[PDB]
Amino acid sequence: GDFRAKVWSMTGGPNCRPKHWRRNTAIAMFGVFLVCIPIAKLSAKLEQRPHMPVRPIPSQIWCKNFGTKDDYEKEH
Amino acid sequence: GGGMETNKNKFIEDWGSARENLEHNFRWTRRNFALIGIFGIALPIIVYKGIVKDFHMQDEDAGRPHRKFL
Amino acid sequence: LEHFCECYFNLSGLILCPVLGSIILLFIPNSRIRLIRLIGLCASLITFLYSLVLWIQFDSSTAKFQFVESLRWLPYENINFYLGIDGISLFFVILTTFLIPICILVGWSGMRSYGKEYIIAFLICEFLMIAVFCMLDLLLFYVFFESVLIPMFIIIGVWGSRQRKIKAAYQFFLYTLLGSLFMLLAILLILFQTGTTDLQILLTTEFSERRQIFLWIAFFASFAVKVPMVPVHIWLPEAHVEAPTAGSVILAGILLKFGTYGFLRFSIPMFPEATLCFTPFIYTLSAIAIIYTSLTTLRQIDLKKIIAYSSVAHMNLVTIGMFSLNIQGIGGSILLMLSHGLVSSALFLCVGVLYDRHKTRLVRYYGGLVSTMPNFSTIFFFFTLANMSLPGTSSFIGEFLILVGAFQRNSLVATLAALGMILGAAYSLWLYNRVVSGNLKPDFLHKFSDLNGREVFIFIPFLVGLVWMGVYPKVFLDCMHTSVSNLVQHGKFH
Amino acid sequence: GRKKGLPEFEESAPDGFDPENPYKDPVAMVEMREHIVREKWIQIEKAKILREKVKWCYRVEGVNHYQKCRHLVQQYLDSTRGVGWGKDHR
Amino acid sequence: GFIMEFAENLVLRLMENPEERDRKAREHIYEMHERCKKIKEMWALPIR
């Protein structure tokens, strides 16, 4: 309104129209992709697939934990 | 106009101060006797008897005598 | 026997730090406000770092006491006193050392009128409370606990907001002293049997079932006042509301923990048979406290009164956990003690932020603050969630572990204790929505300021600690398990 | 200083403890309490290892888990009765 | 060199020797269980 233009918030307050919002949006998208790379690596490392799939699947490209839990007697 | 301090309202402050000084109003009435007898003696006793029985029912479920308490 | 420890960083120096700060501040003119502020802040911060180091050198495999060092009172050496910690007391030392600099920082803006007396009182409190947590002797535990009454009395009486602080301070002092005298009586009865007050020896003496009953009651009379348990809880709302903000922080975050620490440290292991005999009694008292006090909280109209009543329900849940006498119960009781010490302190800090600007505690005056103080609103919401034991926050870990411990012993007590999930949500969300949500009321308040840099910084470590314990409580539980296990087993050999 | 490595303890119960009168050798009493705590943790760690077997047999065997996990389930449930300080005494 | 290996060595140097810590613990008790008799004899001394 009138006083809200003097109020700082993280989400930007009412009717937020930053002038450089396109470049900022692009920078945010690059940041989310960079953050997603290590998450994807950790997920691929951590995934456990006890059963071979019926047909080839995309996770077989990066995940090497297919058919490893067969000897569950030795689990600890 | 001037200041961040709240502009006091006399009735709101009267309400608050009445809340802070309730002990001066206690009269041993019939309603108060009933409320203290029910909620200050009886209900705690009932809860205690419940907790103890729970242990005794566990005791007899395990083939053991009743555990003495208190 | 000199029990001097090998470690460089030990307990005595951590005791000495705030003492030296206080002596130095005794002699600096009140005109040198900047110097006083900086010296007090730096002493407190150095003590905090020292406690962090003490956490690194801690050995999480032994059931013994660590850094044990000794302290020799007479050349006859009949009476010689020991300090030491374990996995039950370590994090309380850390919490004390962490909270004291927060207290100095909260009063930073008003220090020109607060003077050096404010900082000196808080430093003396720090020294006394660290001592209390580090004592392997009943009699010195007594002496160091009563000593905190003097600076706490001064803190409440001098820097409290209004004249009700008089009555509040009187009641605090008198209730606490009555409890302390009861536990002095217990200490002397023990001494007549054993001829000593050394904790390690008492853990290896056998008390009669009868002598145990009497000694347990005399310990209970101090500790239940300290916790507080109903019906000796009524001093707490008055005292925790009338105190200054930092005074309330120290009262809720540290001083309240002393009764539960006394239960964990002396009553449960020294008198296991009495502990067993009184367990239904403790369960009943705590369950009544949780339900009744939560419902009283619901009908309170003062911000500080709502936050103060909330602490009664939380501490009685802690007592249920610790008297469950298993790993979940005691671990959850300790974790909830630490988490409460963070969360209630942060909530008192939020209310203090509001009171410093507007000088009212009455909920009706506030409202619609989300539109003028969004940063405060967000932080307040986070700590409101933490006070409801929301999963992901630190308090949920302790709460659920205590419910686990209680359920395995008595399903009814766990059922009555889980009602807190419903009642605490109710009052916490009602408070938050009446303060922050809705519309502004410009006839009461029309001028506003969100948090400054100091307030944001003050809140940051509380947020970090809450999230850290909430998502990965393993760092704390790994250092505590051996001590907790030996506490649970003490008195039995199968 | 701590030497590098896992903590070391005596495998055996302390010699000097009398179960009849345990408050007779205080040092032996403390040592026996610590030994019992350590033994109890070894039983907890055994039940946890047996739980990993069940977890994986369920996962690997699918709808055949009832017939394939039967012995592992029996072992795990037997180890869990009187484990740690839960709902069973000794 | 490596940060962590140095940090490993530094933390171990800070810590109590577990053997010695558990041994003074035994001397205190053995000495206190058998030392608890001397003082109680003075309290029984007749005033007359």
Added chain:
Amino acid sequence: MYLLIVFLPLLGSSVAGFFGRFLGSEGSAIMTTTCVSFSSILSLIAFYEVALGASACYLRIAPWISSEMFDASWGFLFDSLTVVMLIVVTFISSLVHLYSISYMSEDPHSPRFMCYLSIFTFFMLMLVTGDNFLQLFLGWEGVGLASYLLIHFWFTRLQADKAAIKAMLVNRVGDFGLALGILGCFTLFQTVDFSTIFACASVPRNSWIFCNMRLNAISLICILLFIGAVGKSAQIGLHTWLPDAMEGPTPVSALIHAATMVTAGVFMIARCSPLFEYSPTALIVITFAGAMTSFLAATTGILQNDLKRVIAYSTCSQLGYMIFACGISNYSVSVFHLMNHAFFKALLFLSAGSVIHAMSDEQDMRKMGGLASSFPLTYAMMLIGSLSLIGFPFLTGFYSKDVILELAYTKYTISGNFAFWLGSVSVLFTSYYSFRLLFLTFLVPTNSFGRDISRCHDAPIPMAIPLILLALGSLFVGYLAKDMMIGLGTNFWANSLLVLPKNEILAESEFAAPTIIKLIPILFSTLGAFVAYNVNLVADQFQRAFQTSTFCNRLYSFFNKRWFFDQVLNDFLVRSFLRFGYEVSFEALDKGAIEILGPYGISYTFRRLAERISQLQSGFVYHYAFAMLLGLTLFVTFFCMWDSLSSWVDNRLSFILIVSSFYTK
């Protein structure tokens, strides 16, 4: 890639929440929609890998709560049920984000709204992917929190604040039940891991002491878990929060309280079927509750005047069909119906939102009508959704609803009979209210305001796209997925769902039922449509009764006011607790008796006594001499002349008379 599915909406919400001031409305709309859409694409790939490929995925990040046997962990489980829920949640969430981009375009606070949508999506994903009870509880509470935040999104509105607080408190009552169930599970099995519990569940037979009663432990655990299900799925006990949750913006109603979160109870029952299958008593309880709920919501919805209200009561009734399907041991059918309801109900909420947007936020159906030609696309979407909901033959809702009704018919038990009757009559009621909505909104001669008609507009593209996709789903998804999910002998679910042989009834329902039984859903639906046409078009005086008869007026009120359930609960329960908090705990006790037999009374008496003792120091030298003489006389009397005394005298009476002297004059 499996971690990306769960954590992408968290990343989007974090950027919209912490940096929305740099992105504004447009950036935050894009950032959040992209992250959820990418999670949806990865979810489709995971459905291909796990369900179609028959390759479950297990991922353990770290321990969460490790205390002796207590083994809560940050662990993720991807089986067939999980990927089915993943597709539903991520697809509907992506569509709702896209819809909101245009629906909230004029709202001042859209970035906060998008951040809340994404955080809800993340908590729902945490819920459906957890491999243990504690991670599931975290998701349960998280979706409760996000629902609360979205219901009172317009924070200045007092109705919204009340609705949000009510939703949180009802959900906490369910969470109480759920937490007690989790505690019982841990106590019985010494674990909270799903795989371990399901592998062990057939063995225990022991009895437990619960509140001074001896009960079967498995049954107790299952009933306690079902209490949390009752909370989250708005079943008979804890149903009243769902209609009031309509206070939130329409996209929240579509995503949260119709498609994903409101079905968490059904999902949890389905996921715990390996445990629930060994509690027949709990299954009977579930059967009864679901049936009662379907009838309750169906009868309440027929007199509502607000569009969103009608569609919310529909959701509640549909959730009842899904709960009794579970209670008669047919979990695959309940999950099939869940997936089917997520298409038609989301189509219906978004179509209603389009109508409300076009009518300047008019929501009362009595001020609508004659709108079919003005909003052709929206009318068609609402038609398709309504026909799919009522179970029109060969549409998406036809393949699950009638199979549930046929299975209920085939359950030859008391609760099976109860469920068959109630679901059958509820079909007629739901057909009536669906066609009443269609007729009042689009087909009757217009009852609206001219200023509303003269400012109308149909859906902008970010709104119409999700409507088209949901219409296609509501036409084809049922037929397309029927054999996969409920086809006779299908292995699609693998080990995710468990039906014991003794409870298998699907063959007998498809083969041993009289042909009539299969047609009653079409016949009741046709009758309800006909009754709706007659009531809302050729009735000019069936409203005089409500103005002239006291009994007919009270019944109109009974049904319009939800059986007076909220009134009775507030009058006898909420007011009771609120009054206790002030009149007993605070005023009779804390500030009453405990103050009088405490600091207030103590201070009073010790003041009066110090007062009396001070007066003995009278200032008269004669009193001081007299006191010394009296003390000397006392000394001689008691300490030497107490030899013979003892014959008449006792020590008890001595000290009694002393004290008694205090109470003189």
